[PDB]
Each structure stands twice: as structure tokens, then as C-alpha cells.
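vinculin, pasting as requested.
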Amino acid sequence: KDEEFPEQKAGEAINQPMMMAARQLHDEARKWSSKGNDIIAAAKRMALLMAEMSRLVRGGSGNKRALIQCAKDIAKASDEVTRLAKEVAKQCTDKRIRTNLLQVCERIPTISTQLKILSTVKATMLGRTNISDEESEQATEMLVHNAQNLMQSVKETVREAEAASIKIRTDAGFTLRWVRK
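C-alpha cells follow.
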């Protein structure tokens, strides 16, 4: 059914924080079936792409273009998540839940744009042993922080969209399919 996620190695959280952030999104999205639910499909795609970004930043100058494209792909998926979350908010009859859902999903676009910017920075840095240790470390920290914020925001968006899909005045067939996997 779903694609498998990379095996977790000892020390992943500290050594590969973007992989851990990606794993947290995967863990949330895997609770649900992708059939009839493009938010979940997009979220699973995003977690796998971030896993790839994690692998790419540990490489050399040869991964420059791949790193940039990976960020591009992540942003495209994030735009799909935002669009679908907005529709679910529209169908939600609970004003509070609608507001909160819009609140969290509306931030995804800016975070993904920032991800593309920071990925580009790290990309042009890869393999160049002529760069300051401080500059390389801070670029990494910035990208890691942004990846964590994007994964956390998408994770919360999935959660709120699911609860919001129950607060509708039509039958279940008018919105995203939410069936536990």
C-alpha cells in the first residue's frame, strides 16, 4: 500500500534532525489511508522527500541541484496540503475549528518558501571545504529549524483537518476520506 520509510538508526535525532522531523510527519500520516484523501497522500510524499533532503545534505557538491529540486518538490506538495485544508475549513461548521485550521495551514506557504531559500543556500555550500565552520553550521541550523517547523505545521494541519471533517452538515462523501489504516 504505502511506501516504507527509511530505517531509524541510533542517534538519529541528534545526528540527522531533518530525518527525525520527517519521521514525525510520517508517523502521523501513516495512521490514515491515502485512498480518497489527498492531504494524507501529500503528507506521506512530503515526509519521504524530507527524508531524501536529509540524505542529500550529508553529501557533496554533486547533490547541489538535487537538493534544490527536492525543496521545490516539497513546496509543491505543501501547496496541495494548504489548498485542501482551506476547503475542509470551508465545510467546517464549527467556527473555532475552522479558524484554528486556517490559522495553522496558512503558515505552510511561507515556511515552504523559506525552505526553498535555505535549501538553496546549503546547496551552494555543499562540498566546499573553503567555507567557515561557523557559516556552514549556522546554515545547517537554519535549514534544520525550518524543516522542523514545516513538518510540525503539516502534522498539525493533518490532525486538525481530520477532526474538522467530522463537523460538517452533509454526509461523509462530501469531504476527504478519513479511515484508519
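Note for the archive: DSSP finds seven helices and no strands in the chain.
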